[PDB]
DNA sequence: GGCTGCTTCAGTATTTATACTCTCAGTAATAGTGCTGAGCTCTTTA
């Protein structure tokens, strides 16, 4: 799906900003992505 | 620049497998609750 590392980056960055409102959606798109990919796991998707 | 053929779609005729951890929360059942009366307790003296 998606490089875990870049996600660490984005979230570190929203950490730093929340240390000041919203967050980037890059990480949010990736979240949708990973949710939907897990959905196709084998116990579920049944 | 208005102009005809393809086109795509739309309308007919039972019974679903694997958290965890508090942690709280406020609730509904539930025993604590105290009456009423009354029924027996009891004695009285006429």
Question: Encoding tokens for residue A18?
Answer: 């929340």
**Resolution of this PDB entry, in A?**
4.5
Going by C-alpha positions, the residue among A42, A36, A24, A34 that lies closest to residue A2 is A34
Q: Which nucleotides of B are covered by protein (CB under 7 A)?
A: 17-18
Contact between A13 and A24 (Cβ < 8 Å): yes
> Measured between alpha carbons, how far is A16 from A14 in angstroms, rounded to an integer?
5
Q: Is A45 left (phi over 0), alpha (psi -120 to 50) or beta?
A: left
Contact between A10 and A26 (Cβ < 8 Å): yes
Q: What technique determined this structure?
A: cryo-EM
Asked whether strand B has any atom less than 7 Å from the CB of A1, the reply is no
Asked whether strand B has any atom less than 7 Å from the CB of A44, the reply is yes
């Amino acid at each position: 799906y998606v490089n875990n590392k870049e996600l660490l980056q984005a979230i570190i960055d929203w950490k730093t900003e929340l240390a000041n409102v919203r967050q980037n959606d890059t990480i949010g798109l990736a979240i949708m992505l990973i949710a939907e990919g897990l959905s196709k796991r084998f116990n579920f998707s049944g």
